Amino acid sequence: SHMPIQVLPPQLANQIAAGEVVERPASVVKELVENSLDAGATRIDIDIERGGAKLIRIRDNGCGIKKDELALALARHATSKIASLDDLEAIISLGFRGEALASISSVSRLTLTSRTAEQQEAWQAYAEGRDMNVTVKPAAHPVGTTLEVLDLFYNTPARRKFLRTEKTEFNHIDEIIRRIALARFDVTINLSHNGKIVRQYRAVPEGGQKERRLGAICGTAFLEQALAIEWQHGDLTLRGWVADPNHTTPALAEIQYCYVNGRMMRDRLINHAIRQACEDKLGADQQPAFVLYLEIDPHQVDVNVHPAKHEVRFHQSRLVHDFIYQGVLSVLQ
Amino acid sequence: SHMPIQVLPPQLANQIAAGEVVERPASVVKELVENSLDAGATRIDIDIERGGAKLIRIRDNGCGIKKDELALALARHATSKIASLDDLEAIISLGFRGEALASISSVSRLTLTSRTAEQQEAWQAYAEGRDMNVTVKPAAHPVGTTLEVLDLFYNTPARRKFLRTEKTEFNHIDEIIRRIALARFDVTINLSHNGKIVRQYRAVPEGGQKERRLGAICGTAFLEQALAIEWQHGDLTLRGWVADPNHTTPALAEIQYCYVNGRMMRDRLINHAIRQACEDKLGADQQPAFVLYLEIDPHQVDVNVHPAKHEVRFHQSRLVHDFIYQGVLSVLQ
Ligand SMILES: Nc1ncnc2c1ncn2[C@@H]1O[C@H](COP(=O)(O)OP(=O)(O)NP(=O)(O)O)[C@@H](O)[C@H]1O
Ligand SMILES: Nc1ncnc2c1ncn2[C@@H]1O[C@H](COP(=O)(O)OP(=O)(O)NP(=O)(O)O)[C@@H](O)[C@H]1O
């Protein structure tokens, strides 16, 4: 009662939000790359310096951002991905909060450069001060977008403390890119660290062999034990690969990549079903190895549960669980 | 690119936020009770109808809300608990986002009634419409506050679907109150369902016997196996009770209540330390039974990690883990 109820200064409000969506450099990468994907990008180039605490640069050949919308992209609660509750209940894009960029710009030096196919001119924008004022200026840039995030946490001392070693932080980034690359085989992704290319996943052409990228990402060992899954029932569909439990190793078990309508996701319900199918087939229970993709009617899954979309909730939980169980169990025999 | 980047209508922006902090009636109870606690409340009366999907009423004898701040309490990003980054990095209150009430009012019919010790007059406020307009009107009410939340999710169809049975939903509420009652022995809490009292935890007086409430909440079985802990090192301090592992049952293992600076918390780091201490003492590894309280310098723990504060991150992780380990291991011998 001593302190009056008072609206929070813009920057601080954004920093509170950033603490919930941006835990480390890999988080910034996750959010920016998903934006590139939502933008229709086919090629995404990522440059990281000193694990990301120094610089994170992401360029894509997506549709770009119109000059008159640059500031809006840095504003709070502003998005082009949804505009109604109906849109929210039927999410068909990675983003929908209209918050990621504003959140990130409050805890770093973020620069947005972009040009659309209809523009001959490219522009650049960035926010500053307690009020997060945006300035827009001329720039050179092909069709698409570039995001530059520098000095992550330079203005938030306590959080910068949590940063691990350059190697460790980059490793999480590499793992994040790993998961994203497997979600979209039709997208080329290049990752560099301190001026050196660490990896490049070329997009898989039409009907091309997906095994190629799968093997390039998860390893030949997984590929040799990978059992293809094709299971469907109405809106529900399960695709991907599950390693034979009898030939799964602790190292392979490190591959437990799951997707729900293309979004990377770690769900206890799903993992339980998978493991149960393997347990009921194999002799004992263990950690399965898999890269699975669940496609389901957006109305049947709640994705508005975690600010970073790290969780989901299925309406017909028991049903979905049995679907995956049967699907996996089916292939194990 | 087809849809313009556009600021989200107020109500919808709040509904997106509500999806991340309010998963069910018990969540609404959690947020409102923590407000009552932050307000210095000594007695909190909770009335629930039909598991909370119909009505949730919480009254407290806290300090109240000044008439001219009623609207602000329903506004977004507005709080009296912090005002700077320094305040955020040294959290000493349950709330700090200035968002809970606004979020909840967007997905229910929420009414706020309150009067401060300096006011002879009491007032009532509530928000409405896509823009969340607030109206303030006269009311009768003692010193303190009352929150009324009706028809939870009446305007969000997909989410209302996730509601379980009246019994189930109330059960989560009861469990939430359980955890909160154990955090503050100095607070009286009464819980009723459909017009009937289900429980009432009278506050424990000065130096009074805490065992009383502990036994009333966790059961005599826990109390008979409860081993008191007193372990400290600088800012770090571990207090509470841990059941003898050799005499812990699956039923008792249901009691794994942990607190960090008074805030209920489920942390993997902490649970790991506890279990390890029990494992290293006992013969095998299992689920321990405990009600422990960790007090630590706010600067040493990040509580700005989850919108509902369901998680924390310790800066000196290895250290804290060893502190708890030693603390528990110490008593087991
Ligand atoms: N790489 C990009 N290419 C094209 N448009 C982009 C890109 N990144 C961001 N945008 C635009 O900027 C707006 C989004 O900023 P952002 O802060 O990421 O919110 P969001 O994607 O709408 N939702 P969320 O990610 O859930 O907060 C988007 O809605 C797009 O219109
Ligand atoms: N029961 C209460 N008694 C007195 N003041 C209250 C009570 N509930 C809410 N308030 C006031 O209303 C403002 C808070 O609304 P709320 O939306 O719960 O945000 P918060 O508690 O500030 N932060 P957070 O809970 O993290 O969103 C508080 O900061 C208090 O000033």
Ligand SMILES: [Mg+2]
């Ligand atoms: Mg986004």
Ligand SMILES: [Mg+2]
């Ligand atoms: Mg609050």
